[PDB]
Amino acid sequence: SIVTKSIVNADAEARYLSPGELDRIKSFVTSGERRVRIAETMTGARERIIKEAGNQLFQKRPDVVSPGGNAYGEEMTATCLRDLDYYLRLITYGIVAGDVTPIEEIGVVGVREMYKSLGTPIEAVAEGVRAMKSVATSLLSGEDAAEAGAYFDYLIGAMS
Amino acid sequence: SIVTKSIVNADAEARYLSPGELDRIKSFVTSGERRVRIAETMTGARERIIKEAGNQLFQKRPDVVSPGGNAYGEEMTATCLRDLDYYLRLITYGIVAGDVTPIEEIGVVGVREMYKSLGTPIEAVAEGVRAMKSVATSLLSGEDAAEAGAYFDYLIGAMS
Amino acid sequence: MKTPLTEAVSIADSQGRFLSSTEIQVAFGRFRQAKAGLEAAKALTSKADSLISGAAQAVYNKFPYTTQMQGPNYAADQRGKDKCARDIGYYLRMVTYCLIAGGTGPMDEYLIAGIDEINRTFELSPSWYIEALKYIKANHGLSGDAAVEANSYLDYAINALS
Amino acid sequence: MKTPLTEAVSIADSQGRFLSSTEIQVAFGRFRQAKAGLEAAKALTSKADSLISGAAQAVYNKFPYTTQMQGPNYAADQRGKDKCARDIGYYLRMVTYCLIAGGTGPMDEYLIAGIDEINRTFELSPSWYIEALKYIKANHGLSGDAAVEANSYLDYAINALS
Amino acid sequence: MKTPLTEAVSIADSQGRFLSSTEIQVAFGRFRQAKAGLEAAKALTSKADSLISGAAQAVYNKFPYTTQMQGPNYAADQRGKDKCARDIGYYLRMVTYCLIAGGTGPMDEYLIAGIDEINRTFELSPSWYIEALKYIKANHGLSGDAAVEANSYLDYAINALS
Amino acid sequence: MFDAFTKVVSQADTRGEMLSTAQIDALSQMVAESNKRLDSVNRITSNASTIVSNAARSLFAEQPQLIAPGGNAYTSRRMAACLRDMEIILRYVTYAVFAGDASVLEDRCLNGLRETYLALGTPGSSVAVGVGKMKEAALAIVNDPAGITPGDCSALASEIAGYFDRAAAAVS
Amino acid sequence: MFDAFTKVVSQADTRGEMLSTAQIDALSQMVAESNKRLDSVNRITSNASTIVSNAARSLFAEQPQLIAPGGNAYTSRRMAACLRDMEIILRYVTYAVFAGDASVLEDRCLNGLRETYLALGTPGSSVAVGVGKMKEAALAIVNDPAGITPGDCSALASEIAGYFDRAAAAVS
Amino acid sequence: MFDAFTKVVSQADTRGEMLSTAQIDALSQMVAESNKRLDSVNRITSNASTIVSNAARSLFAEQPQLIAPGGNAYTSRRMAACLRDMEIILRYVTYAVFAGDASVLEDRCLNGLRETYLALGTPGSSVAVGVGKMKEAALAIVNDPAGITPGDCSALASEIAGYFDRAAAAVS
Amino acid sequence: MVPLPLLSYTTTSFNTRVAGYEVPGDEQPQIYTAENMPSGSEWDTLIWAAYRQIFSEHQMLKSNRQTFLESQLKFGQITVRDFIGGLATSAPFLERNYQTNSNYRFAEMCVQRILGRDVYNEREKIAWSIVIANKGPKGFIEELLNSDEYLDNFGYDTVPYQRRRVLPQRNVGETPFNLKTPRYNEYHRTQLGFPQVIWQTSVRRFVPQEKQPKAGDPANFLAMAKQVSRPANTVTRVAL
Numbered sequence A, B: 001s002i003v004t005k006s007i008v009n010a011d012a013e014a015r016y017l018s019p020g021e022l023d024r025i026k027s028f029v030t031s032g033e034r035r036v037r038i039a040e041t042m043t044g045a046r047e048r049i050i051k052e053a054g055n056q057l058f059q060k061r062p063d064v065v066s067p068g069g070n071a072y073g074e075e076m077t078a079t080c081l082r083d084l085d086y087y088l089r090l091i092t093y094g095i096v097a098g099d100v101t102p103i104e105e106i107g108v109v110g111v112r113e114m115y116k117s118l119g120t121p122i123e124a125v126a127e128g129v130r131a132m133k134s135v136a137t138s139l140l141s142g143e144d145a146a147e148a149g150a151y152f153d154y155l156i157g158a159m160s
Numbered sequence C, D, E: 001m002k003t004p005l006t007e008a009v010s011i012a013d014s015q016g017r018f019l020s021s022t023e024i025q026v027a028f029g030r031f032r033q034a035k036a037g038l039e040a041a042k043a044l045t046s047k048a049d050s051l052i053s054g055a056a057q058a059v060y061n062k063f064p065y066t067t068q069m070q071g072p073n074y075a076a077d078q079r080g081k082d083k084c085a086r087d088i089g090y091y092l093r094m095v096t097y098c099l100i101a102g103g104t105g106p107m108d109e110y111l112i113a114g115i116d117e118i119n120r121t122f123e124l125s126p127s128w129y130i131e132a133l134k135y136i137k138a139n140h141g142l143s144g145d146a147a148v149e150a151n152s153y154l155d156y157a158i159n160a161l162s
Numbered sequence F, G, H: 001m002f003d004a005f006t007k008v009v010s011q012a013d014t015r016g017e018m019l020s021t022a023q024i025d026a027l028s029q030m031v032a033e034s035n036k037r038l039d040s041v042n043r044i045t046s047n048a049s050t051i052v053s054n055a056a057r058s059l060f061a062e063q064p065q066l067i068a069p070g071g072n073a074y075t076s077r078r079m080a081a082c083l084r085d086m087e088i089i090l091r092y093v094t095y096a097v098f099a100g101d102a103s104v105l106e107d108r109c110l111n112g113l114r115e116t117y118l119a120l121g122t123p124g125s126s127v128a129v130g131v132g133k134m135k136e137a138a139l140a141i142v143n144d145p146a147g148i149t150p151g152d153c154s155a156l157a158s159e160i161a162g163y164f165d166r167a168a169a170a171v172s
Numbered sequence I: 001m002v003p004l005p006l007l008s009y010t011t012t013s014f015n016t017r018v019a020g021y022e023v024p025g026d027e028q029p030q031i032y033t034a035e036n037m038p039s040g041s042e043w044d045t046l047i048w049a050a051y052r053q054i055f056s057e058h059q060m061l062k063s064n065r066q067t068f069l070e071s072q073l074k075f076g077q078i079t080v081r082d083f084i085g086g087l088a089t090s091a092p093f094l095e096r097n098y099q100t101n102s103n104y105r106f107a108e109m110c111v112q113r114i115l116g117r118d119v120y121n122e123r124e125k126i127a128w129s130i131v132i133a134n135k136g137p138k139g140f141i142e143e144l145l146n147s148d149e150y151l152d153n154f155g156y157d158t159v160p161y162q163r164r165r166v167l168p169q170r171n172v173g174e175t176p177f178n179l180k181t182p183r184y185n186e187y188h189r190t191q192l193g194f195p196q197v198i199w200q201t202s203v204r205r206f207v208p209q210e211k212q213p214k215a216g217d218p219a220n221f222l223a224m225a226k227q228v229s230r231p232a233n234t235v236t237r238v239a240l
Ligand SMILES: *[C@H](C)[C@H]1/C(=C/c2[nH]c(/C=C3N=C(/C=C4\NC(=O)C(CC)=C4C)C(C)=C\3CCC(=O)O)c(CCC(=O)O)c2C)NC(=O)[C@@H]1C
Pocket: B064, B070, B071, B072, B076, B077, B079, B080, B081, B082, B083, B084, B086, B087, B106, B107, B118, B119, B120, B121, B124, B125, B128
């Protein structure tokens, strides 16, 4: 969360919480009611966004659908669609968390090793989540979509 | 098994193994080729056993179909056969071990509370394994129904 | 469910008014009816099984072809006789229900409302049920005004059949 | 009177529009139908009397009780046989009328619309007429597409009966 | 979507009955129509671009004022000609769609239903489209019964226009 | 829409058997006390306008916020609708104690009127208190003797107070 | 409410171009086999009352709880409504295989009747099994060539079983 | 369905007192400027067909995807329905600025048409931009002087732009 | 007694309130009118359509048939409107549809069947429910058949139908009212007590997390075969 980093960076110098750090915690909890209402609406529209963003990958990068590519056939593209269900579920974890360290524990911190080991193109994974933001911005009002859209764009440069 | 009941009865006197008792391990191994042929034949029609024997249970016990009893709809009767699939898994676990101690440590040792606290009576599950008993003899031969039927009535004795 | 108190409430509700002396006249009349009708329904409950078997035997007697020809609509096999005498007992139970309820409502809601299309789809002649109801109304063995209104309900079932 | 040209005019009238190519497609199809159907109706007109007697004899054969029991609904006496074979000829004449008209309209207006309540009031089993229509559709002796649509009309009468 | 099979299903559904021989007459007629109409639609697909340009040039020829006066409704500039020939190709594509569908349904749902208010709001004379459809029905170059029913669809569009 | 007799008939049909004897003795006692039940009903019915006027006045003496401007029953039209709602509730109570079953009272009022009073902004508390006061006055009007032969009025006080409490709780 | 031809027309209009040639060869083969589609449709239609009576006959032999008192199809009125529901489903199957598209079957039954059977308390499982048995009997009645020229009904057994499985799954 | 005067009357009745003096001076100034409100309303009304045609003219120049095949306003019938929807919105704007209250515009369009455009698949963004452009052109047509005595129309440009922005935001 | 006016309610956006610039097609409801002097068979189709509209298909039983109302209609003694009023006030309709519903749901059902449209909002159901309570179900049906909305759309001689169910560009319209509003809701279903979700269709532990349906996004697979040419040949590209 946001207090998870703010404890630890205040911990390792044996300091208490300095009031430059508390005011972003006090700003976080008044913004907590907004980010819950963000994090329902992505999960309320969860079924309609997983086949929409996956269809948006398949026109811009159809090479992975093609035989010889990794996501070939209906069965391998079925597990190359959940694979995307986690990365929507992880982003709506971090939206209600305030910070991005739930995604840094589950999503990214070994993903350059395993997608090298699985043979899937990691750049096309970031093309899907870049498509997944642009459909997720359509459902939400823009002043809340600017909040959630930074959590998407964290992950875009994280994969590539 | 015989062997893990052989050794745990030899630690209770802290001696070696009795040589007449070593023949019941040697009789356990040489009579093992026909025992695992029973177990795959129950496994090969485990849905054909269950979808038949479930139907003759409900004509015998109409309380669990007419509303007012314990398990109903699709939402609990599928869980009711989820119990009977576990017990059928225990018998084919018990046949390859030769004894009932895989059924003892897994599936009968706490049965008189986990249905007693869960609202359902005991004796209809004891009528369910009897429903499973009649269709287990009919798939097998004469002597194979005698050995495999010797594990079904152990389930009746611990429950009811 | 055409029972007298229910239809009195329906009249007073559709008129939009309170209850008047008319519904109380309906009520002392209904209690007068029920004061014998409940005991007559108990007596029919007592004689029910023998009446059902006698009606089934009279139906097999007047229509002997139904016992002979092969056909799932006919009671040649045993399951036809089980289902057959089951619907005999159905008719008798609806007669007792209308005797308790005080109106033709229960038979009208449980039997009459679809019986024509059922006998059309299933190749059941309604004359079989007419013969059975005639045997029941001959052999129920009641007496007096209870017997007359029991015969009224059975004749109503007959007229609804054919 | 559900005949194709009549219902095409009804469609164009209820829509409030002129005739389109749809009704002309209906028309070249209807003329294609009538080009064999009129000769098939003439052939049924030729074989009609023997078909009526054969259907009546098959009905007496499958249901022998109707010749035996006394009853004005049954054809035990001679007037029952006259009236009976009269309604056999009625059914066959309606089949020929629907063959000429090109639709199920004439049987739907002359036979079907009240047949259920008539058989209910008169204690006539419709299975007798089903047996007779089955004998007619077995023994009409036509061939080809005319035979298939003749069997279509007779099967329609059977499904309307039971 | 007034196509013959769709409207046959609508008739049988609104009547509440099964399909009869009437709809099968409609069907053998519809297949008779489509057996030439599909090839005629392919031939119109082949000649489509030259027909569109010829219709646009004939429309500019008969109404020369539209090329001259400044106005966004008139095709004086180039964007008027692009949009103009686009709706020429729209009309021709709807003609081919009705040739495939076998009824006036596609033009009735895609063109006709709002064309009057659109030409009212946009200051488009429908006589321009009448001239273009007349040039198309003169110059489509088909022959026989396919040509007659193609002219039928185009004349239907003309009568729907004015 | 059920009687007492149709209730026993539906229960006996759901059982699938004939009516048992003890239910028939219960229905015989019901047929003996059904007139009982309904003389009681008739003296309840004859004073209905006095009952609703005394209930409303007692209520509007008790909660003057409803009469106050901006109150829910303040406007003359709304106040007439208020008295109409109360009279309707009393009428369906009299119907339910006529037929001897609460299913008519349930069917005609209860399932919808709670949501109606929520959607209207009607306070359910005041009309609940008004139905309670109307029921108390109704039993008080029914129970007194004035030229009528002595009878076992009691239980039927039980049933009438049951119907009124069911109405007041379904209103909420 | 779509044909085969109107389906190709709507797809070609959404594409915005003319109809491609391979779709026209497909529609030519459809026009060649559309009568073939039809022969099964007419022999399916002529035996419809026998189909629904045999389907209910096997279903109520199979699940006697529906005939049992308290069952959903127990009452004579409800049993007639049951046969009416089945006959309606068979009729819309015949309509969909007439027009050659499942959109009529979707439009007329599917989207509402699942919620209808939930709200009514109708068990969707029994009517699903009944539609499955009715469809099995319908293909079994259609596939037998009695007094019919020798042809190929392969793909149309495919299509009819598709329509019946769509109906049975939309019922659930 | 409220006026300005009925709005003050409903507020004064919810207060429960008479109308205060400052509200009466405000309503006197409203009665002085109500003609001012509406001569412009008349110059807004007289050019309505030009307004909706120029609005659709700029909108379909701006978003050619709607005119493109497969677009929401592509079909001739749908395009006529599009112009009808726009003309309806302009008419209810003129009604609301006639009565001087936004409650008529709310009542007649707003609460349902957002859900209607969601259910239809209509893009709310394009019609929102079209109502915004139509409102900009409407104030631009209203504000110019061509033979009319000069006056300060500052609060009525304020009110008309308020009504148009309320319509565009309720559409979304 | 001063007549209490109908309670005011707000209108919603519906397809029936706008002008339809539509060409007649297969989705248009068949209009059954008595104005065209119907043949003896057309009278039976009109009567059948009126029963289907007011009762639903499942309630077209021989026992529910109003033979006296049908003979009055066929003789021209009553209008099609009066026939619809007679059906909606009939004993079988009140027993099956009025007694099994609340006044709110009965009002919604009558608006859908008689006016051929949906209810605008919950407040319209409340506004009609008080008419049912004050005048009974008969006086409510008469007030609905006397509405300007009924007269303007159907007159005296037309059988009511579901108005504008399908839009001309959509293969899927609104749900038919007979499927949307069945005879009774969940509330009366719970009062009747019993349904026996008799039989299963088992399977042994097999799901947890899979979105199987690729369905629509695929597929292209046009494919291509690629040739070979020299690397040295400036194909690679040299800026400057
Ligand atoms: C079915 C023949 C009988 C029956 C079954 C029933 N069970 C439940 C709930 C549970 N059943 C189990 C059963 C087992 N758990 C085990 O660990 C083992 C050994 C491996 C067995 C055999 C358990 C744990 C539960 C709790 C739920 C779960 O599995 O997660 C129900 C539902 C009860 C409810 O109220 O929901 C039913 C109906 N009951 C009967 O009536 C039949 C006699």
